[PDB]
Amino acid sequence: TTIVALKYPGGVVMAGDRRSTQGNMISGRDVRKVYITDDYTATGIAGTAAVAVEFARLYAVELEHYEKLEGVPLTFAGKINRLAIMVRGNLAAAMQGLLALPLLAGYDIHASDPQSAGRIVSFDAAGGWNIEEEGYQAVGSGSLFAKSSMKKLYSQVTDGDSGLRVAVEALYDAADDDSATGGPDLVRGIFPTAVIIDADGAVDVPESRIAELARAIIESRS
Amino acid sequence: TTIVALKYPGGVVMAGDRRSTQGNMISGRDVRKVYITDDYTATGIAGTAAVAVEFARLYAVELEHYEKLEGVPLTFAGKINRLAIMVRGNLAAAMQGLLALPLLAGYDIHASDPQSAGRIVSFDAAGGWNIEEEGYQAVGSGSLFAKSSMKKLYSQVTDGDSGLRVAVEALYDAADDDSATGGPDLVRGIFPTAVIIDADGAVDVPESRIAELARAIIESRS
Amino acid sequence: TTIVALKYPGGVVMAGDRRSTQGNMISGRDVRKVYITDDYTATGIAGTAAVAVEFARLYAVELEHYEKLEGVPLTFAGKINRLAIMVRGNLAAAMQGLLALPLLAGYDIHASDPQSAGRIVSFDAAGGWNIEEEGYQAVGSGSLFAKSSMKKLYSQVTDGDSGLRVAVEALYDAADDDSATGGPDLVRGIFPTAVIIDADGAVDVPESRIAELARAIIESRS
Amino acid sequence: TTIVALKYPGGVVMAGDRRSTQGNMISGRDVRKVYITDDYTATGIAGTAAVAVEFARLYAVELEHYEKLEGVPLTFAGKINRLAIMVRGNLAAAMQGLLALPLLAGYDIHASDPQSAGRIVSFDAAGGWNIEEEGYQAVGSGSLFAKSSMKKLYSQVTDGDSGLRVAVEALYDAADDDSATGGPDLVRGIFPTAVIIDADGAVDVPESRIAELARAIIESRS
Amino acid sequence: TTIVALKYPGGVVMAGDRRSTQGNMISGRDVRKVYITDDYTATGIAGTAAVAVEFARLYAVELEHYEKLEGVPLTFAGKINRLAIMVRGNLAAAMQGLLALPLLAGYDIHASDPQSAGRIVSFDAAGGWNIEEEGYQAVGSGSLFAKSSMKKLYSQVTDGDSGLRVAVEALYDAADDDSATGGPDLVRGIFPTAVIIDADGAVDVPESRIAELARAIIESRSGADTFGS
Amino acid sequence: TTIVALKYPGGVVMAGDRRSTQGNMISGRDVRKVYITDDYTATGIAGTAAVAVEFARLYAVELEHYEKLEGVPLTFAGKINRLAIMVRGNLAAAMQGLLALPLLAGYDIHASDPQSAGRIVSFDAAGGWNIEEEGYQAVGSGSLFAKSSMKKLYSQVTDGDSGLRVAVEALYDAADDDSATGGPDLVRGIFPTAVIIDADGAVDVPESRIAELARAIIESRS
Amino acid sequence: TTIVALKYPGGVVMAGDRRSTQGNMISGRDVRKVYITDDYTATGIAGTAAVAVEFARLYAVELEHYEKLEGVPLTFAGKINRLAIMVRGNLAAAMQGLLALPLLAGYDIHASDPQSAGRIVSFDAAGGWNIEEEGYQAVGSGSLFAKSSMKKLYSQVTDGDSGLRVAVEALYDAADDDSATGGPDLVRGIFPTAVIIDADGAVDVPESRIAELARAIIESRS
Amino acid sequence: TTIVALKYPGGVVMAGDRRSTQGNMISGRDVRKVYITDDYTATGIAGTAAVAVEFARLYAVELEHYEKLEGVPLTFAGKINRLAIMVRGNLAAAMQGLLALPLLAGYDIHASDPQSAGRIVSFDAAGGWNIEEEGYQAVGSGSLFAKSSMKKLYSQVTDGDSGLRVAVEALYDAADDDSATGGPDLVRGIFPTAVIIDADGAVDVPESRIAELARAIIESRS
Amino acid sequence: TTIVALKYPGGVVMAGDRRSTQGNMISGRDVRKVYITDDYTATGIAGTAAVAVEFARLYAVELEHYEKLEGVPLTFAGKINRLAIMVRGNLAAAMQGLLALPLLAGYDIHASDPQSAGRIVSFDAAGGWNIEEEGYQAVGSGSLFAKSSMKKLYSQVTDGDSGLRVAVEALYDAADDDSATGGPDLVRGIFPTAVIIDADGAVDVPESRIAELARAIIESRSGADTFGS
């Protein structure tokens, strides 16, 4: 697994691969790892699938629960804290093999400078969180490869489009070095999924868009 | 890793993938796992790379050593016994993470019937060998997948070209289900390697032919 | 044990073997592993028999309990979630040898397109679920063999009849390679059981039809 | 595995199944477990295949080695002692998973009365041997079932043919209750192997004869 | 220990041996292991004596408790479930050396066909149950021996008496190969116990019929031994 | 197992049961546990069969080896010492489950008073020996029962036949309380074996004699 | 990590590095480790990031909570006690890899001599606290290096500005010897953070001041 | 530690950092990790310093030893084999904390083509070797980062100087993410070391050249 | 323990403390830890006393053994190698509690430039050695404190006497923070020991210069503490 997230002026893009493994065996080829949590937030989770899914589902419910109860959405800092609490709560189980790490991406509506409102927050197994200031982050077994790739490609992220394109190339680099991360499947037409978030909210990126980017990258390296 | 071997009329074909791993990380993309041991024999080894290579190298030297010394090649049964002894000798190390398993394919020049002269021998970690009677065999982390594939495809084998085609498709299936086995790499132009053996001896299959087969298989599943 | 499930246009078929084991000893010859959970759902469970049976029984009661209480059936997603919660709740006991994994098959009445309403959901020991998108799935000690078999036979699935046939042949291949899975018993007349589900509901397949398929598969391989 | 041996007037018959397993997986379908050790002796070995084969091979060499060296065959008691020493020597290896238990059957040329020259000797893991006085014995994971079957069938043994038939039925019963023992495979035409020994020496029983016996047993149970 | 149960037309018979052991030592010679649970049910339990006895006693009370409370007996399936729950509940203790496995036999007064109303249910240590369709089952350290014996003798079961005989012969065969199972004791006059159940209910088999049957098996065995080698 | 030895005027008698066990399973019904070691000595060994047999065999060879070499038999004390040395030498293996305990009975032709030239020596696992002065001794899993029985039946020993009778009754009581000891088998005609030694040497007791005693004991208890 | 605190006439200064590590990998470059807890107190925490952050956050809330509730701030001693209690409460978790140790710095408004109202308190893993009397203290994996540096530089501290310079040089010396402490990053413009507290309250030190000081220190060592 | 090696037309370049660590403590700032082994070979070793140095020293002696003895240098393949054997020999020690991994770079004068003569060989802890075909390779705690860096920069290598530049930038990237790898030290004037090898032999690169490239890389990143 | 070594123009100085401990107990007050190994080399060893002493003794014998045998001293590199081999051989014993780490200081008569011909070599438990290039090094339980002290004081080393003073001050700083390192004992008159090596060879430093320096440091620290707060 590899989930990447990058900031671009005015927003964030988060993208994840589709593979699932049981040791060396491929057990999934179409898993969706990036979820739209609320109108301005997306969560990508790596690790133990059962736990990852439960987290994303519970987290979204908790966020909307607060909104309906209090009539307004939680501040971005509150969102981080709630997620952090959930992670911290799973520490015992994580020690026993139920480890799951989330990656948070969002657009802060209350931030003073709108082109700078994008947010990327990473989490460690103990719930320690960190608001990324360098533009990108990644989580999962291929995250180092992805991050090292983005480090060299980030200068290219000038907008949400080139950001989506870079994200996809980072995932591609991750799969090129981590067997547990799935690359673009041209035979079956399965590609990484992605979410983009700007001032107008979080939106799922059309698969056809990602497939086009993927094919171009492949042609390039060819 | 996946190495497969199968019998076709008047011969045997053995083919293997090119991947190398260190946990989830891809550490090799062009490893050659199938060796021509002598004029009528080929060996394919799976497991710990260091040991696998040493085995093939030592084994070929031991076979040639006998011939030069005694003026005549070892009988096929003798070749099997020597390989089995080598595997048994490595058992303690195998238990400690140094496991290597070979797969043997050859053409017995002294066989009564030539269309039937192809031989396939599999080995377990204790050196137990078995001369395969059902036409095909495989070894490695993707061997179960490859075998399940050849079981449904074997009836198509009627000659060298089709035997070769079925071998490549089996490897393809293995890679599809086992992240530790490498599928054809179209971007880099790296394909499985293969050896064909018949009455005229063991010959390395040209990459061009294998690549044509791989593209056809791919186009077929598309 | 091996339980298979596959999608056909307009529905699903789920079939299971009848063997029970205690180590190497055969302890059961006619265990029923596929249950009709409600009018549009079937469950097949592998692993520890005591737990498998309890699961199926409790699950069906829970589904009907909701229906009577709320006047309407649970959505398919709700059904999946309930089953996943049950599995996750057995994780401690499972770590201790009370492991039970279910396979869920159903026809979604509320889905927009009926030809595609068939559903197949697999579960891992932590309760992680996955809605299969590739058409088939399997669970149990013979599942790899069955899945590899279905992979090459799936393209022949065009209706419930060819579906049910591919299912029985997959179970046959599983028994051929996994001693813990029971093949068709011609001497005693015991065959795999199966359930078919379409817009008209879940129905037990008649033994005589499975017996005919089994015998044909056998004569064919002969 | 199940290997049986029984006495009929003027001879002995020993028969074994053909299965090989790796856990629950069937790894072999045509393994030959009964060997003609010398002109009047046959050995059947159960347990770890690699060790079992080595034992039979070494044992036969040792017997012939004595004969050529001393000009006369070893007495039957000497043969027993040599085999027992071999087993005792493997005890430490056996404790680490390399266990092999043999079953010995023969006709003793130095016996006083010929219809009473038949011999059956069983061995335990420490090399302890026992000359069977009740007519039959079995070794392997299915030996209890086979022995319990022979117990009820032995009274029908009146000559070599009926002895061979009871042996095959015992193996059949073993396969019926032990998944690690292979029953007759009608689809592939693979049957138990057998050796008969009488005053004229040890001879391999023809496959066609065993297949007929097998079929009749099957017809009868059906 | 060995407890067997088999189906015969119109009924079921369950019989058990009388031995009790503490390691190699014989600690009991007259233990009764087959209990009449209710008018149409019988239970035979193997394993740790103290647990086995508690099970049978508690189970019988629970079945009768339901009947009095609800005015009607539990259905046969309910009986099975209740026993399975009891076994599952002992799983932790069983791991600590307090294992007990029961074997259930009964006649279902509500089944459709009275000639086939007999029931035999086996249980594993986790409480997994299974209704037998081959006519017989056995539990205990000698069960494998008893079943392989019954496999060859089941075609002789054509009624209650021949079923009782086959059962006794299966227990005999178990004692012949399992030192933990007690064979018929001719010197002390102690024999396996047995319960028979048909449409008229569960009944204890009289020692005298079992004693005759056992001597007959022994005599047959002697004769046959002398005839052969 | 139970082996007994008792002194009667003019000699000693040693008798053993015929059972063999593998846990709770009866693995032997006619094992001979009492051996005539030399003309005036008999050995009975309990414990691990393989080791027990090796001991008796090796011990007799040792005793005879000395005699041929030195022209004269070893003194009784020398015989004892050589057996004790053998037992001590097996201490490490015994600690590992290969324990064998012998019981020695003999007639000392060099003793002063021939009415008591009878000798009975017991041994512990460390090779510690004791010349029994109270008239009887026993070894094996039923030894306590046999000794308590002999304590009450010893005053009845007035000669060889009454000694032989007491020995058999002791073995009978041992089988009555120890499932690992075999009682007289009337159905198969198998009875305990015995050796009697007096001034004229060690002699195997005829089976018919023992069968008569056994039947008389049984009749008396009935 | 390295956090230093030192007294200067009329106040205190606390400064910390910005590095975060996961084994040998640098996982953070801009972490802020020094927090203004209330108007006259600052906290610096080392160890496990997740726990360190939680501590600072909870601690500040607890101090303000008291103030609002009781209308007056907690005495400095009370503040110490509350922080110690919090550390002590984490002792079991700390033993398992969740260790965090705080360093407390403050200006005591209720102190007698204002020129000596500065306070520095260190804490051990059991919650043992110590009011530093020698002028400076440090915590974290680089605290030894920093303390030995300050020991030689402390006499240069005559006011807030020289105090700040000494603090920054101590952190520089810690990073020079401890790979887990981050030195000034001139390429990215990231520098240690600091808080100065005097009679007018706690104030964050401007990054530009620290960068000036850091450049002077580096020029000095060049 | 990080050591990198790359191919440029007509040559190879190998460069390594200068850091040494003891846990978190920096224990060395000028360690030289790249050695000229013979006129056409360079070795770089990572891991336990004591063992790394011993390897390089021993290896260079063994290669010169062969040359003097046989009058001709070892073939490049022979050099590889000798180094692999040395690594294999250290496996027991490696498992106990004395693990050292080598990276080999050379120019092969017997290669068919001079421009393509450059060689790069990597090794695993069991002595498994691999002749790199993709142009670059790295070893050490920062090798992943360096490899991901080179992957993006390799297309810029057009000659010996651009190759040395990419090498230094790769080391820089490694130091940026791995605290155990040392970046250029401008205050002390310590830079990575490097060796270039072409048809004229292996030569140490002058510090001044490296220092310019390093400052340039740093100026660029600012 | 703390043993320090530093380069000064034209030479090297090595000095060590005198303490010995058994847990928290002070078991020695006058141990001598710095040995003149040959005319141009000194060794200081920290760790397990028994092993430390054996090393120094054996090492010196090995160096003189070579000289007598070959008629010429071992090159400085050879001396390093021999010491590293000795340390690696003790690796298994060290893992068990017999760890001893040496610090080597010498003057290389064959170095090119005499002003910098001084040498300082440190060793890790596996025998890994490093020729120090920054002027100073230290070994023992107080080595970190001593090294951080010398870092700030090294710029004051302009000759043999100031080198020695920085060395005594470093040991004094080590003793200040490490209870296992002994400070100057004024009551008993026990002070660190030291060896100086230059082109004329290795020589022991007289106790009196070291006692003067130690008192001076103490007077300094006392003044400084009174001036501060």
From Swiss-Prot, chains E, I:
Annotated metabolic or biological route of this protein: Protein degradation; proteasomal Pup-dependent pathway
Keywords recorded for this protein, A-Z: Autocatalytic cleavage, Cytoplasm, Hydrolase, Protease, Proteasome, Threonine protease, Zymogen
GO cellular component: cytoplasm; proteasome core complex, beta-subunit complex
Active site residues of this protein: 1 (nucleophile)
Control of this protein's activity: The formation of the proteasomal ATPase ARC-20S proteasome complex, likely via the docking of the C-termini of ARC into the intersubunit pockets in the alpha-rings, may trigger opening of the gate for substrate entry. Interconversion between the open-gate and close-gate conformations leads to a dynamic regulation of the 20S proteasome proteolysis activity.
Keyword Cytoplasm in annotation: yes
Biological process terms in GO annotation: modification-dependent protein catabolic process; proteasomal protein catabolic process
Subcellular location, record wording: Cytoplasm
Enzyme class, broadest EC rank: hydrolase
Annotated catalysed reactions: Cleavage of peptide bonds with very broad specificity
Protein family membership: Belongs to the peptidase T1B family.
Assembly description: The 20S proteasome core is composed of 14 alpha and 14 beta subunits that assemble into four stacked heptameric rings, resulting in a barrel-shaped structure. The two inner rings, each composed of seven catalytic beta subunits, are sandwiched by two outer rings, each composed of seven alpha subunits. The catalytic chamber with the active sites is on the inside of the barrel. Has a gated structure, the ends of the cylinder being occluded by the N-termini of the alpha-subunits. Is capped by the proteasome-associated ATPase, ARC.
Role description: Component of the proteasome core, a large protease complex with broad specificity involved in protein degradation.
Protein name, UniProt field: Proteasome subunit beta
Organism: Mycobacterium tuberculosis (strain ATCC 25177 / H37Ra)
Organism placement in taxonomy: Bacteria, Bacillati, Actinomycetota, Actinomycetes, Mycobacteriales
Full protein stretch here: 58 to 286 of 291
